[PDB]
Symmetry: C3
């Protein structure tokens, strides 16, 4: 019930970097709104570091979606103007993935971790 923060730490970095691009709304409004929804769920996943193992496919895909947001945010300053639509579509799909992840059943997650299955 207490945890050292890693998912939530890596997510707060991505939020603080995205917020800087106020003029570009798919990042600073849409994506940070989704990421701020997802942020408490990352906090309580990190608090459950004992009951969960972060290797399962759901948490590995959480890692990978937050890392796609990270990579996209860090490359934004070099997105050329004629890549706008392209990049926006990419940002939107990151957004959608994060939202679907926010429907994760944590109790079933730690359940499947405490007891073996087929």
């Amino acid at each position: 019930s207490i945890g050292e923060a890693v998912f939530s730490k890596l997510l707060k970095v991505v939020i603080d970097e995205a917020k800087k691009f106020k003029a570009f709304k798919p990042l600073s409004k849409d994506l940070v709104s989704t990421m701020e929804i997802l942020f408490p769920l990352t906090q309580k996943i990190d608090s459950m570091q004992k009951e969960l193992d972060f290797g399962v496919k759901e948490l590995k895909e959480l890692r990978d979606t937050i890392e796609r947001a990270d990579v996209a945010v860090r490359k934004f300053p070099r997105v050329k103007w004629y890549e706008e639509s392209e990049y926006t579509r990419k940002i939107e799909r990151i957004n959608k993935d994060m939202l679907k992840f926010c429907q994760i059943d944590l109790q079933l997650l730690q359940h499947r971790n405490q007891w073996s299955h087929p």
Copy 2:
């Protein structure tokens, strides 16, 4: 009835700089059209340098609106593509302000300058 040009000089500079960005129409069409409407009014304000004092709040705001146009024009080459909407809104409001100023009653201006009031 004869004046050394200062409002109109600072406005002609801003016009000649804005005109250069032919591809970007909010500057080179819309803003220079408004500024070319306002330009003769600046000429006759400068010709009246005796009857008016340029310290009153209307002429200080004329100074400040022409200076917002100046600053915006000089920063345009470094407006990034995802700031377009933002910058355009700013340019539009400069435009609107200039137009409203072109309804200034000069006779009431020099009147309030020749005789004291409460």
Copy 3:
């Protein structure tokens, strides 16, 4: 009925350069589609290097249209964002010209070249 390739060589260069800008569709979809339609016609014009002389006004304008595509493609990386509409219109007209050229009557061309006229 066999020819060393020059129109078609200069056109293949322009195609391979335009294709690189995948994100920008007026170039990499629209213009290369038109140019790939025009490409076999350039091949068979080059194969007919004996029966035709490339000096006539139709083939000189083929030269000049392919060279406008070349110049436009090579300058694209320095098209600023607020020139988009402008440049796109230019690209579109190159496109239209190429398409109309693809209605050239080659038989009448080599005919007017084999026999003198007024």
